[PDB]
């Protein structure tokens, strides 16, 4: 059982190989460009129909509808432009930790402590939202679900594995078992040929949906990773964690570019997202407010303080026109 | 101005009032988290009250609707989903009295109770504590001294004394003794008195919550 020494040797080799490439920090390169300045964002709309704390949300690809999941056993779909509720789906189990709204808009997904990713069919005859399928097979609570298309879906449960499902058949086609802790987040690249999962072992990973192999592993955190989001370019991502530290990794350099932290911030991060161009970096905190980090200068650019509790979820539309932040306050504001 | 959106707003208001009605119906319910150690007496108390990640148990006693969430079926880190249960009315903790000389296991239950009795989320959620298997305690005290588990136990090896000592040891574990109660009951298998004790404790917790809402407390 000496192969542990070999594993340590390859770890040291990886450290030296990704240390040689560190020509200059991104902050050194970016110090020459002008900062974005203070950014004012105001609550254009507030969506108040949830009676319990909200644990997730997701925008449609039309950037107008959004689905929000709370612990009151409801999965409401809002028309953000006019605040109307389009649907109000009663859930099988009121213990829900995630939701996903399909790219085509036909389906919605929802999971939680019941270890089941139950997907709902919106655009159907009979005018009611009917459970299309109940994907079972995870042995732990689901933490995030994302639709590849109307056909497939990738989940990330607390059994330290991510899986890829075939909705029509209902059976897993690929399973990703490389983590050692609960997989608390998941994010699909814009081309949906590879995704990243943030675990509680303080290490993200770069998976391949086609094969099922972890291409790269990105360590560097000191606590559990609660959120993750690809850069819009698709060649980088930023991870939130419990140590009040958000840092931007890079797939091509296989390292961490910088870190977004401040001494006055000691509250962990529950959600991370990018602006449409990727210059900004929204990040929700337990401190009840969001912070608009400058993704290239590491400086702040604003605060989104309108919630009375942890902002558990946060999302930027596909056209970049708005930022929706849902909190345990049971209100889901929409900034701009 | 709102040409066809009038009917959309009407549908929104209708499903809004449906949401409000369902929320009131759910607020009528009273929820009880259930915990315990391995192969404890939790299944026993579930069977007493007649009613695959978590198992929810619904039962009604004296015009009160209880929901019971058995969560011990999740093999994941407890620190990540334990904030989902903030706001639960009480906690039903099961401890087996017959497991003081098995593997240590009593110390495991004690450390679990300590870890989830001083929790940041359950800082005011009063704990209802059960102590199953009194008959096995009677059987085993006469032959296995309580000094096996508690080496400092200086007292008689009678069932009443040992049971009171264990109850006091468990109730000693709440640091904020002036914030949350720890109701204790030795699970009896007759006349469904266990659900009566649960009802009394839940009524006390409801009274305390009403006092806090009214501002008197």
């Amino acid at each position, epitope marked *: 059982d000496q192969l542990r020494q070999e594993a340590e040797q390859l770890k040291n080799q990886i450290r030296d190989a990704r240390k040689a490439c560190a020509d200059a920090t991104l902050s050194q390169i970016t110090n020459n460009i002008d900062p974005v300045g203070r950014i004012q964002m105001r609550t254009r709309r507030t969506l108040r129909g949830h009676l319990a704390k909200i644990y997730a949300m997701h925008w449609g690809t039309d950037s*107008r*509808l959004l689905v929000s999941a709370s612990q009151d056993g409801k999965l409401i779909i809002w*028309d953000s432009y*006019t605040t*109307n509720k*389009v*649907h109000a789906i009663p859930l099988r189990s009121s213990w829900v930790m995630t939701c996903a709204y399909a790219p085509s*808009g036909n389906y919605v997904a929802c999971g939680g402590l019941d270890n089941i990713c139950s997907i709902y069919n919106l*655009k159907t*005859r*009979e*005018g*009611n939202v009917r459970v299309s399928r109940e994907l079972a097979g995870h042995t732990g609570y689901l933490s995030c679900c994302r639709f590849l298309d109307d056909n497939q879906i990738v989940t990330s449960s607390g059994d330290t594995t991510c899986a890829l499902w075939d909705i029509e058949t209902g059976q897993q086609t690929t399973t990703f078992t490389g983590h050692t802790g609960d997989v608390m987040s998941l994010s699909l690249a814009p081309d949906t040929r590879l995704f990243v999962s943030g675990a509680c072992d303080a290490s993200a990973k770069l998976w391949d949906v086609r094969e099922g192999m972890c291409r790269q592993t990105f360590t560097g955190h000191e606590s559990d990773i609660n959120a993750i989001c690809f850069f819009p370019n698709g060649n980088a991502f930023a991870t939130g964690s419990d140590d009040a530290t958000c840092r931007l990794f890079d797939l091509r350099a296989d390292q961490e570019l910088m870190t977004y932290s401040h001494d006055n911030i000691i509250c962990g991060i529950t959600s991370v997202s990018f602006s449409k161009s990727g210059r900004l970096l929204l990040a929700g905190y337990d401190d009840f407010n969001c912070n608009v980090w400058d993704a290239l200068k590491a400086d702040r650019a604003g605060v989104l303080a309108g919630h009375d509790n942890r902002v558990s979820c946060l999302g930027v539309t596909d056209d970049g026109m708005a930022v929706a932040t849902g909190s345990w306050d049971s209100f889901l504001k929409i900034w701009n | *101005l709102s*040409a*066809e*959106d*009038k*009917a*959309a707003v*009407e*549908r929104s208001k*209708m499903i809004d009032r449906n949401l409000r009605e369902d929320g009131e119906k759910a607020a009528r319910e009273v929820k009880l988290l259930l915990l315990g150690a391995g192969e404890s007496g939790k299944s026993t108390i579930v069977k007493q009250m007649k009613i695959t990640g978590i198992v929810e148990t619904h039962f009604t006693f004296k015009d009160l609707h209880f929901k019971m969430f058995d969560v011990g079926g999740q093999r994941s880190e407890r620190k990540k989903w334990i904030h989902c249960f903030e706001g639960v009315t009480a906690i039903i903790f099961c401890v087996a009295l017959s497991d003081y000389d098995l593997v240590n296991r009593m110390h495991e239950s004690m450390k679990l109770f300590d870890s989830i009795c001083n929790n940041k989320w359950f800082t005011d959620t009063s704990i209802i504590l059960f102590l199953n298997k009194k008959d096995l305690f009677e059987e085993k005290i006469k032959k296995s001294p309580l000094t096996i588990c508690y080496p400092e136990y200086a007292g008689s090896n009678t069932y009443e004394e040992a049971a009171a000592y264990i109850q006091c040891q468990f109730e000693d574990l709440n640091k904020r003794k002036d914030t949350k109660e720890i109701y204790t009951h030795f699970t009896c298998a007759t006349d469904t008195k266990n659900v009566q004790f649960v009802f009394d404790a839940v009524t006390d917790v409801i009274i305390k919550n009403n006092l806090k809402d009214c501002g008197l407390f």
Partner: single-chain antibody
Amino acid sequence: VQLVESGGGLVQPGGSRKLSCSASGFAFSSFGMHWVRQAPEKGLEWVAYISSGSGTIYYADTVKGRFTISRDDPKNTLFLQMTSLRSEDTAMYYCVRSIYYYGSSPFDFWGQGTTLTVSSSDIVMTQATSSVPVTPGESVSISCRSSKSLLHSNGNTYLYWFLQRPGQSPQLLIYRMSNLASGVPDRFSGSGSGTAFTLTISRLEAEDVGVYYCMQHLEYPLTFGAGTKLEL
């Protein structure tokens, strides 16, 4: 889904008669329901409407007050109660499903309709080409000319296109002037701006010849068109 009819038959004018539309196959309590009638010598005409939950009721001016529309949600049945009928009310009454939310497709399903006979600020649309003969495969255009700007502030031009096969209830082809209905072949297409609309059919074939109707939904009372008729 399914919508049936009951309550027809010859009626002495000045009397009363009730039409029942019992729906079986969909969540009836979530759909608003309309009554639409078609005179033997004329085209479709709006009559009445109930929202979901009976929170809003509208009537056409020609039947306002005399008629009464009501629904029984637990029984899944829709009632039209007509009092003091006249000879102009002889028609065939369809029972139309309609659900209103963002992205919905109202007027999608039409009942089979009953054939009651009686013995003895309104946006007007015109369809100049009352009829035209064609052959399969030809690309044919049907034009609708409104009288008020149907393009609302929110950019949604409220105009619907229906097709009535010979001896059949009409079916929704296009809703809001551009979106195809569920099940309609992608050869149909709609375009145009306010007060100028067009329905384009490519590679036309048989079993697609009928009367094409043009409706608005900008404001009640809902108004149909005369109806361009296709033939082989």
